[PDB]
Design a binder for this molecule. Structure first.
Ligand code: MED
Ligand code: ZN
Ligand code: ZN
Length: 354
């Protein structure tokens, strides 16, 4: 039995090592055999998903205006580490806790010294990931306290659920985007006396997920006009949509906090001492998983900024700065991970919450 607040690892709650299925849906014999052959993989996803469900339920109980963004992320991450039973690269946090505010939709997590305080009128996107053996759960929701954003939230949730319903083996990615867009734009909202037709953020998308690879190569667009490339049996996708009251386009903005090794870059010998050490720290602790500066601090690293810049300039590491729409705009996000199994579509991260 899990504690409140949560402290019992998910592994210890299901002793037989069999974890709960997410929501299974029929798509819009030999395949059953093929499905069962990868059971250990689905099971890993499911373990990671249960951890995600329990962490997020916990976060929803205490997240409140008044808290610093740092306090929020540290409290969330602490619980996540505990429930996933962090163990080097075999079990852990898949990527940093996004807590993007307002016009900012994605890739913001505070660095050391950030004094930002969560406000009553803030619209905060909590996007965090867990993994078991590199089987990643990428799942996200939006937190508000002012009911004025209720319809904006409902639009994006509906858009995400539409994307999830439309997804399937042999489904064209461009169709999913068109579908998402149609639902999203069917919503109009009124916030502080102004009305808006909700728009999808056109340069943001969902994505295929691979082992230790958050962005495996295929993208799921949230507007019409994309690639007719088809989804394939066995693939795993992060179905995420973002709605905005602004331009519906994001740009890089603010201090960068998120970084991730380029998956395709091989071993590179480095003699520069600080740069060498940092790359070793990244290889040991994150591999190709994304990390943030706070995660370097926590490992006792200091004076690493120039080394990190070197790694970026070399193309060994890529920076992922916050992506924000225009000043004054509001953005919302909902996201789930789905498994395109041979016998069905599993919304693995589905919970009783969203
Ligand atoms: C790179 S960390 C953020 C990861 C995931 N939420 C994405 O944007 O694909
Ligand atoms: Zn995400
Ligand atoms: Zn994602």
């Amino acid at each position: 039995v899990q504690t409140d607040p949560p402290s019992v690892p998910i592994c210890d709650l299901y002793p037989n090592g069999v974890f709960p299925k997410g929501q299974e849906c029929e798509y819009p014999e030999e395949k059953k055999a093929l499905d069962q052959a990868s059971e250990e993989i689905w099971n890993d996803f499911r373990e990671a998903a249960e951890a995600h469900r329990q962490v997020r339920k916990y976060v929803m109980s205490w997240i409140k205006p008044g808290m610093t963004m740092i306090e929020i992320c540290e409290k969330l991450e602490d619980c996540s580490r505990k429930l996933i039973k962090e163990n080097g690269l075999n079990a852990g946090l898949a990527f940093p806790t996004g807590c993007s505010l307002n016009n900012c939709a994605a890739h913001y997590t505070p660095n050391a010294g950030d004094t930002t305080v969560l406000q009553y009128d803030d619209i905060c996107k909590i996007d965090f990931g867990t993994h078991i053996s590199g089987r990643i759960i990428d799942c996200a929701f939006t937190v508000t306290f002012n009911p004025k954003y209720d319809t904006l939230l409902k639009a994006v949730k509906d858009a995400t659920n539409t994307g999830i319903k439309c997804a399937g083996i042999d489904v064209r990615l461009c169709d999913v985007g068109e579908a998402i867009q149609e639902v999203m734009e069917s919503y109009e909202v009124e916030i502080d006396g102004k009305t808006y037709q909700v728009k999808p953020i056109r340069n943001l998308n969902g994505h295929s997920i691979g082992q230790y690879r958050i962005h495996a190569g295929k993208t799921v667009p949230i507007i019409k006009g994309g690639e007719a490339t088809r989804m394939e049996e066995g693939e795993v996708y992060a179905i995420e949509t973002f709605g905005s009251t602004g331009k519906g386009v994001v740009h890089d903005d603010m201090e960068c906090s998120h970084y991730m090794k380029n998956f395709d870059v091989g071993h590179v010998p480095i003699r520069l001492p600080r740069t060498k050490h940092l790359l070793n720290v990244i290889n040991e602790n994150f591999g190709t998983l994304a990390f943030c500066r706070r995660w370097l601090d926590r490992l006792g690293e200091s004076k690493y900024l120039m080394a990190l810049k070197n790694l970026c300039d070399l193309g060994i590491v890529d920076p992922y700065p916050p992506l924000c729409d225009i000043k004054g705009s509001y953005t919302a996000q909902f996201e789930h991970t789905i498994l395109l199994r041979p016998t069905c579509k599993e919304v693995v991260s589905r919970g009783d919450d969203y």
